[PDB]
Design a protein around this motif. Sequence first.
Motif, mmCIF file in Angstrom:
data_model
loop_
_atom_site.group_PDB
_atom_site.id
_atom_site.type_symbol
_atom_site.label_atom_id
_atom_site.label_comp_id
_atom_site.label_asym_id
_atom_site.label_seq_id
_atom_site.Cartn_x
_atom_site.Cartn_y
_atom_site.Cartn_z
ATOM 1 N N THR A 127 0.335 -0.572 -11.745
ATOM 2 C CA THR A 127 0.140 -2.215 -11.640
ATOM 3 C C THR A 127 1.006 -2.228 -10.179
ATOM 4 O O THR A 127 2.181 -0.954 -9.575
ATOM 5 C CB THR A 127 0.938 -2.644 -12.510
ATOM 6 N N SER B 78 -4.144 -5.165 -11.228
ATOM 7 C CA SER B 78 -3.625 -4.861 -9.520
ATOM 8 C C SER B 78 -3.213 -3.806 -10.591
ATOM 9 O O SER B 78 -2.795 -2.578 -9.589
ATOM 10 C CB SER B 78 -1.451 -5.149 -9.378
ATOM 11 N N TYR C 205 -7.644 -12.641 -9.519
ATOM 12 C CA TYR C 205 -7.346 -12.517 -9.975
ATOM 13 C C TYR C 205 -7.530 -13.399 -11.845
ATOM 14 O O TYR C 205 -7.094 -14.321 -11.897
ATOM 15 C CB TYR C 205 -5.545 -13.144 -10.067
ATOM 16 N N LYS D 143 6.546 -7.637 -16.787
ATOM 17 C CA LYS D 143 6.499 -8.807 -16.518
ATOM 18 C C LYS D 143 7.678 -9.317 -16.442
ATOM 19 O O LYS D 143 7.356 -10.571 -15.598
ATOM 20 C CB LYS D 143 5.346 -9.332 -18.006
HETATM 21 C C1 LIG Z 1 -3.713 -2.827 -21.610
HETATM 22 O O1 LIG Z 1 -2.942 -2.321 -20.661
HETATM 23 C C2 LIG Z 1 -2.739 -3.577 -20.244
HETATM 24 C C3 LIG Z 1 -3.143 -3.965 -18.323
HETATM 25 O O2 LIG Z 1 -4.265 -3.633 -18.593
HETATM 26 C C4 LIG Z 1 -2.598 -3.565 -17.348
HETATM 27 C C5 LIG Z 1 -2.190 -4.067 -16.946
HETATM 28 O O3 LIG Z 1 -3.217 -5.552 -16.348
HETATM 29 P P1 LIG Z 1 -2.267 -6.677 -15.753
HETATM 30 O O4 LIG Z 1 -1.924 -7.796 -16.723
HETATM 31 O O5 LIG Z 1 -3.116 -7.347 -15.163
HETATM 32 O O6 LIG Z 1 -1.579 -6.652 -14.585
HETATM 33 P P2 LIG Z 1 -0.949 -7.207 -14.070
HETATM 34 O O7 LIG Z 1 -0.164 -8.277 -13.126
HETATM 35 O O8 LIG Z 1 -1.827 -7.127 -12.579
HETATM 36 O O9 LIG Z 1 0.627 -6.087 -12.445
HETATM 37 P P3 LIG Z 1 2.337 -6.077 -12.865
HETATM 38 O O10 LIG Z 1 2.936 -5.378 -12.799
HETATM 39 O O11 LIG Z 1 1.866 -6.798 -14.633
HETATM 40 O O12 LIG Z 1 2.493 -7.869 -12.397
HETATM 41 C C6 LIG Z 1 3.375 -8.158 -12.824
HETATM 42 C C7 LIG Z 1 3.665 -9.602 -13.148
HETATM 43 O O13 LIG Z 1 3.970 -10.228 -11.363
HETATM 44 C C8 LIG Z 1 2.322 -11.152 -11.407
HETATM 45 N N1 LIG Z 1 1.136 -11.300 -11.183
HETATM 46 C C9 LIG Z 1 1.295 -10.177 -10.020
HETATM 47 N N2 LIG Z 1 -0.172 -9.730 -9.127
HETATM 48 C C10 LIG Z 1 -1.591 -8.352 -9.049
HETATM 49 C C11 LIG Z 1 -0.588 -11.615 -10.078
HETATM 50 C C12 LIG Z 1 0.012 -11.573 -9.171
HETATM 51 N N3 LIG Z 1 -0.156 -12.998 -10.019
HETATM 52 C C13 LIG Z 1 -1.060 -14.362 -9.768
HETATM 53 N N4 LIG Z 1 -1.779 -15.506 -9.489
HETATM 54 N N5 LIG Z 1 -2.198 -12.862 -8.547
HETATM 55 C C14 LIG Z 1 -1.721 -11.389 -8.200
HETATM 56 O O14 LIG Z 1 -3.280 -10.726 -7.687
HETATM 57 C C15 LIG Z 1 2.241 -11.749 -12.543
HETATM 58 O O15 LIG Z 1 2.768 -12.502 -13.002
HETATM 59 C C16 LIG Z 1 2.448 -10.773 -13.307
HETATM 60 O O16 LIG Z 1 2.434 -11.193 -14.536
HETATM 61 O O17 LIG Z 1 -1.484 -2.932 -17.783
HETATM 62 C C17 LIG Z 1 -1.209 -2.726 -19.600
HETATM 63 N N6 LIG Z 1 0.020 -4.257 -20.519
HETATM 64 C C18 LIG Z 1 0.035 -4.983 -19.635
HETATM 65 N N7 LIG Z 1 0.720 -5.664 -20.057
HETATM 66 C C19 LIG Z 1 1.132 -5.307 -21.304
HETATM 67 C C20 LIG Z 1 0.785 -4.340 -21.126
HETATM 68 N N8 LIG Z 1 0.685 -2.902 -22.277
HETATM 69 C C21 LIG Z 1 1.498 -3.376 -23.290
HETATM 70 N N9 LIG Z 1 1.806 -4.749 -23.280
HETATM 71 C C22 LIG Z 1 2.629 -5.528 -22.051
HETATM 72 N N10 LIG Z 1 2.582 -6.924 -22.617
#
Ligand SMILES: [C]O[C]1[C]([O])[C]([C]OP([O])(=O)OP([O])(=O)OP([O])(=O)O[C][C]2O[C](N3=[C]N([C])C4=C3N=C([N])[N]C4=O)[C]([O])[C]2[O])O[C]1N1[C]=NC2=C1N=[C]N=C2[N]
Lengths: 300, 116
Positions: free
Chosen positions: A171, A201, A29, A136
């Motif tokens: 996600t 994710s 991650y 988030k």
């Molecule tokens: C470009 O497309 C974007 C991304 O490509 C795609 C998602 O990708 P991601 O960001 O990687 O997301 P994720 O962290 O894997 O899953 P989550 O549902 O956001 O988890 C919520 C929360 O849960 C925690 N969590 C989650 N996971 C799996 C963890 C972990 N913590 C750990 N220590 N280990 C881990 O394995 C952590 O606190 C996360 O924040 O969605 C788009 N997108 C994202 N954000 C925005 C956006 N678009 C527009 N505006 C935005 N603000």
Amino acid sequence: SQAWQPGVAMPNLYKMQRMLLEKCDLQNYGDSATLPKGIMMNVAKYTQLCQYLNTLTLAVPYNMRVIHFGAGSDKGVAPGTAVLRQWLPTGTLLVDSDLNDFVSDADSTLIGDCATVHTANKWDLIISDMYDPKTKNVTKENDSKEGFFTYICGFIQQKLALGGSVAIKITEHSWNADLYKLMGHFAWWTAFVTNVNASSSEAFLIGCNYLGKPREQIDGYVMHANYIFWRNTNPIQLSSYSLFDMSKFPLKLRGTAVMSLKEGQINDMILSLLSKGRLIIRENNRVVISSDVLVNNENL
Amino acid sequence: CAFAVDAAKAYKDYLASGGQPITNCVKMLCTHTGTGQAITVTPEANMDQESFGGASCCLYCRCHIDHPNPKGFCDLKGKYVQIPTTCANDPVGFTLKNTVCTVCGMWKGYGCSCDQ
Ligand SMILES: [C]O[C]1[C]([O])[C]([C]OP([O])(=O)OP([O])(=O)OP([O])(=O)O[C][C]2O[C](N3=[C]N([C])C4=C3N=C([N])[N]C4=O)[C]([O])[C]2[O])O[C]1N1[C]=NC2=C1N=[C]N=C2[N]
Ligand SMILES: C[S@@+](CC[C@H](N)C(=O)[O-])C[C@H]1O[C@@H](n2cnc3c(N)ncnc32)[C@H](O)[C@@H]1O
Ligand SMILES: O=C(O)CN(CCN(CC(=O)O)CC(=O)O)CC(=O)O
Ligand SMILES: [Zn+2]
Ligand SMILES: [Zn+2]
């Protein structure tokens, strides 16, 4: 090994479990892939998605109709749409939408909440990269989400041609139980993680060849749990390898056949051809779209 | 009333002043075994070129301003524009400052060999 693939699809044995929902904890991650020079993440991401869609049984009729939700970006442009229009046969009707304004290569672009979007005609392919930034702010149990997922489920049931396919970004926390249930209404389905974002994710939930009725009853709460279980116990190596071979990228124009047909006429032979990517069912009229606009006079 | 905003001039002068070229032009993955033609319906870069999404490389599209065309039609949107790899730092500048030969379809001066 997986690293020369565009990405990784959820192995079937994980689909078959009855897991409970745990927190997602990926060992890589935060790591970022090395992207080829000057290539945006979402060009790489969508390229890999399309490379994987090339291995399924998509219907590809003449005058394909494709709709792309969540196609805008903080940059004001539509990298995803650019890859789709590249990948799709030339002259494929491509419509896209986003909540915020952006510049697009789509044939037509609608700005506003996706729930305001309406279309007279059905579609052979639906793509969604929508994601709410408020997801988030995790403040509680990871429950099924609604919002644009509620729209998407209804839109599929109402305006996806039979034989059509979908890819819908989820996600860990941006997910929906009915969407998983509705995957049971396609001939085949998976969750596909691109190799350039293997550290996220994120997955694309892919429904291949829509049948308009359930092949299978899927508990969406259980299945998302299965999916997190898979991701949690199968770390994926970040990889950009597949981006370097674009020789076979274009979607082969199959000239898939299109029939209007009434519900009475959908027999098990028709249902077989849908399952194989060999038939699309819908009107073949003109493509017409609109966005609902709320009117307010702010004076007084 | 003769007044219209001359955005082409504005950018050309901003560049000349040393302004940072417009960014976030959307570059495509391709084989780079294409025709080298200037503007195409799918990426056609050769080994000397990068291919980009047209809309993102168009100064009017990107600036939210009207296209200098009676009907407003845009040459780039919905298409792919091939940019000399040596000018791919400023694809918007390139497409504005240069011209496409009506005969062979290559950039006048960056592929057009119709004078030979
Ligand atoms: C470009 O497309 C974007 C991304 O490509 C795609 C998602 O990708 P991601 O960001 O990687 O997301 P994720 O962290 O894997 O899953 P989550 O549902 O956001 O988890 C919520 C929360 O849960 C925690 N969590 C989650 N996971 C799996 C963890 C972990 N913590 C750990 N220590 N280990 C881990 O394995 C952590 O606190 C996360 O924040 O969605 C788009 N997108 C994202 N954000 C925005 C956006 N678009 C527009 N505006 C935005 N603000
Ligand atoms: C990761 S971004 C899309 C990036 C884009 N696909 C690209 O190719 O770079 C997530 C998008 O989903 C959109 N979105 C989120 N909720 C939405 C909603 N209810 N209706 C329409 N768009 C929404 C956001 O405005 C945002 O642009
Ligand atoms: O209001 C809408 O049109 C879409 N709705 C969902 C309503 N759906 C039907 C459904 O519940 O599945 C209508 C549609 O998608 O056509 C989204 C929301 O409430 O945020
Ligand atoms: Zn333009
Ligand atoms: Zn010439």
